[PDB]
Amino acid sequence: VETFAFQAEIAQLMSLIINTFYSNKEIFLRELISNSSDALDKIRYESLTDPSKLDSGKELHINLIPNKQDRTLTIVDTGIGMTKADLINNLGTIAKSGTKAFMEALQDISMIGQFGVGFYSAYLVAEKVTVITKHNDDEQYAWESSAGGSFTVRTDTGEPMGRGTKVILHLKEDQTEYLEERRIKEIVKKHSQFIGYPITLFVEK
Amino acid sequence: VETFAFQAEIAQLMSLIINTFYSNKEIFLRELISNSSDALDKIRYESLTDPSKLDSGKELHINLIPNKQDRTLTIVDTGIGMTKADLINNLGTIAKSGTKAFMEALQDISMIGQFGVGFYSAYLVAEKVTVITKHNDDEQYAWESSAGGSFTVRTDTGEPMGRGTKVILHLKEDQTEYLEERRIKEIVKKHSQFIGYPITLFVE
Ligand SMILES: CC[C@@H](C)Nc1cc(C(=O)N[C@@H]2C[C@H]3CC[C@@H](C2)N3c2ccc(C(=O)C3CC3)cn2)c(C)cc1C(N)=O
Ligand SMILES: CC[C@@H](C)Nc1cc(C(=O)N[C@H]2C[C@H]3CC[C@@H](C2)N3c2ccc(C(=O)C3CC3)cn2)c(C)cc1C(N)=O
Numbered sequence: 027v028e029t030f031a032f033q034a035e036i037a038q039l040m041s042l043i044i045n046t047f048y049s050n051k052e053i054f055l056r057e058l059i060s061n062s063s064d065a066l067d068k069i070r071y072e073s074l075t076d077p078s079k080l081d082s083g084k085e086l087h088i089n090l091i092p093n094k095q096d097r098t099l100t101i102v103d104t105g106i107g108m109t110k111a112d113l114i115n116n117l118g119t120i121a122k123s124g125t126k127a128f129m130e131a132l133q134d135i136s137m138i139g140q141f142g143v144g145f146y147s148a149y150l151v152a153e154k155v156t157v158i159t160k161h162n163d164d165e166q167y168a169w170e171s172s173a174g175g176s177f178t179v180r181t182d183t184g185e186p187m188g189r190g191t192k193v194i195l196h197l198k199e200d201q202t203e204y205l206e207e208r209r210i211k212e213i214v215k216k217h218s219q220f221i222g223y224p225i226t227l228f229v230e231k
Numbered sequence: 232v233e234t235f236a237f238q239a240e241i242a243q244l245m246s247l248i249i250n251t252f253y254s255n256k257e258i259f260l261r262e263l264i265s266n267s268s269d270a271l272d273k274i275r276y277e278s279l280t281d282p283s284k285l286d287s288g289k290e291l292h293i294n295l296i297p298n299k300q301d302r303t304l305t306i307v308d309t310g311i312g313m314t315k316a317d318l319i320n321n322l323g324t325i326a327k328s329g330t331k332a333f334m335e336a337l338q339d340i341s342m343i344g345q346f347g348v349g350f351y352s353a354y355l356v357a358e359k360v361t362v363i364t365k366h367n368d369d370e371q372y373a374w375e376s377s378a379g380g381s382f383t384v385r386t387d388t389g390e391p392m393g394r395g396t397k398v399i400l401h402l403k404e405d406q407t408e409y410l411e412e413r414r415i416k417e418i419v420k421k422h423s424q425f426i427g428y429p430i431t432l433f434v435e
Contacts, residue, residue, distance in 0.1 A: 067425050074424075124345055127332035140329070142345050220272050222427045 027180045033116065035125040036146070037175045043149045044173055048135045054151050055204070056136075056217035057144030058101045058193055062088045063221045065105020065191060072106070082162055082189035088221070090214075091228045092205040097197050099151075099204050103223075104190035107161035113169045113179045145193075149173055151204055152195040158182055159191040205230075232385050235319060240330040241351070242380045248354045249378055253340045259356050260295075260409070261422035262349030263306045263398055267293045268426050270310025270396065274367075277311070287367055287394035295419075295432045297410040302402050304409050308428075309395040312366035318374045318384045350398075354378060356409055357400035363387050364396040 032040065066086050073079040083104050091100040108117070119142045128141040138147050148155045157169040166187060171177035195204075203209045210227055218225060237245065271291045278284040288309050296305040313322070324347045333346035343352050353360045362374040371392060376382035400409075408414045415432055423430065 070425060119342070119345070121336050121342070123332045123335040124342075126335075127328045127346065130328040130332070131326055137324075137326075140324070140345065140347050142342075220275060220427055222425055 027178055029176055029178050030114065032171075032175055032177065033122065033125075035122045035129070036116075036120075036143075039125055039129055039143060039146055040149055040173045040175075042129060042132060043135075043146055048150060050135055051150040051201070052204075052213050053136045053138070053217065054147040054195075055101075055210070055213045057139045057147045059088060059214070059218045059221060059225065060139055061145060062101060062103035062105055062191070063223060065103055065107070066223050067105075069104075069106040069189070079162060082160075086223055088223055088225045089228055090210060090225065092207070092210060092230055094202070094205050094230060097199075097202065097205070099195045099197060099210075100192055101195075102190065102192045104188070107164075107189055107191055108157075108159045108167075108169075109161045109164040110167055110179065112161070113157070113159070113167055148193065148195055151197055151201040153198050154196040156194040156196070157191060158184065158187065158194070160187045160189050162189060232383050234381050234383050237376075237380055237382060238321065238327070238330075240327050240334075241321075241325075241348075244330055244334060244348060244351055245354055245378045247334060247337070248340075248351055253355060255339070255341055256355040256406070257409075257418050258341045258343075258422065259352040259400075260306075260415070260418045262344050262352045264293060264419075264423045264426060264430065265344060265349060267306060267308035267310055267396070268428060270308055270312070271428050273311040274309075274394070284367060287365075292429045292431065293426070295415055295430065297412070297415060297432075297435055299407075299410050299435060302404075302407065302410070304400045304402060304415075306398045306400075307395065309393070312369075312394050312396055313362075313364045313372075313374075314366045314369040315372050315384065316369075317366070318362070318364070318372055353398065353400055356402055356406040358403050359401035361399040361401070362396060363389070363392065363399070365392050365394050367394060 070086055085104055087104055089102040124141040125143055128138060128143060131137055138144050154172040160166040166182040167179060168182040169179050207229060214225055275291055290309050292309055294307040329346040330348055333343060333348055336342055343349050359377040365371040371387040373385050373387040374382060419430055
C-alpha cells in the first residue's frame, strides 16, 4: 500500500466539491458513465487494428450495481482500463489549467465534465471512492481516496476482472437515494440515454 | 448586415489558432462532428416528450460535403440548431474561464474540445467560416467570420434547411487535402468512428 498526495489543484477542487452545497448532484452518474463510454471507445478502437486486444473480454458494456446493505453504488465497465502509471501520475487528460479553469467557472457544477475532471464529481455523493482497474498491459490495481488531500494505490487481490474498471462509491448517509432503482433509472434516462453501449442495472436481492 | 466584435478572449484564441503552427490540424473535423452529435442528442431528447419537435425533419444525421470547385468542406447536421441570440451572444457553454485557460494548456491543440471551444479549431484550416442554422423557435440565420476580431449575422433567405446547422469551411489554399475522399474517411475512422448517428460522405 503506497500513499500519495493529490496534485495541489485536485486537492483544491476536491475540497470545493465536498465543502460547498450544490443542488444538481445527480450529474455525478452522467460523468462516471461518460468516462466508462470513453474507455469503451478506446479499447474498441484498438480492437479494430488488433483483435487480440479483446482476448481479455469481447463484451463492451456498462453495469450499475446498487447495494443498500453496503451503502455502495458501483459503476463497472469493460473499457480499456488504467495502468499503474495512470493511477499514480493521473491521466494525461486531467491538466492543471483545466482544473483551474473549472474552479474559476464555479466561482453550474454540471460544467465539470467539459474540463476533463468529471470523475471528482463522485465526491458530491461519496465519502470514499475505490477504483479497481485492469488494463491489458498491466496487473489489476486498486486506487482509493476519502479526499483530505491523499490517495492510495495497491495491487488488487480480489476477483479477477478481465479488463475494464469498477468505480465503487461509498455513499454519504444523506445520499442513499442513488441506491434506488427508480432514481437511477430516471437519471440514466435524463442524462445518459443515448450512450452507445448497453447500460444495465443489476437489481438488488 | 450587422457586424459584432468577438469577446476579447475569443479574438485572442482565434489569432493564436491562425498565427501559430500546429501539426495535427485534422482534429478540427473531430470537433465539428462532436458538436453536430451533441446538437443531435439535444433535439432527440426534446422530441421524446414532444413529438412535434420533429415536424421540421425526423432524420437525425451528419453529412460531410467536399467541394473542390468552391474549395469548401461543409459539415451539415439536423441537430437542434442555434437561435439569433445564440449567434449574437454566443453559447452559454463557451465561457471566458475555459477560453482564457485553454491558451494556458497550450502554453497540444487537440485538447481544445475539453475547454468548450472546439469550434474555433475550424480556423486551423479555413480562412473563412460560414455557419447557416435553423432552430425550431427562430428563423434561418447566417453567422460568418474571416477572423480579424469581428463576425456578421444576417437572415438567410437562401435555401430553407428545415432544422439543424451547416458549417461551411472556406479552406486555406495549402489545406485542400481535407477535400479528398480518402483523407476524410481516414479522419472519420481515427476520431469519429463510434458517433451514434450516421455520417455520410457525399461524392462530388
Ligand atoms: C480510461 C481513461 C478514461 C477514459 N476513463 C476513466 C477515467 C477515470 C479517471 O479520471 N481516473 C483518475 C486517475 C486516478 C483514479 C481516479 C482519479 C482520476 N485518479 C487520480 C490519480 C492521481 C491523481 C494525482 O493528483 C497524482 C499526483 C498526480 C489524481 N487522481 C476513472 C476513475 C475511470 C475511468 C473509466 N471508467 O475507464
Ligand atoms: C447547438 C450548440 C452546440 C451543441 N453545437 C454547435 C455549436 C456551434 C458553436 O460553438 N457555435 C458558436 C456560436 C456562434 C457561431 C460559431 C461561434 C461559436 N459563434 C460565436 C458567436 C458569438 C461570439 C462572441 O464572441 C460574441 C460577443 C459574444 C463568438 N462566437 C456550432 C458553430 C455548431 C454547432 C452544431 N453543429 O450544432
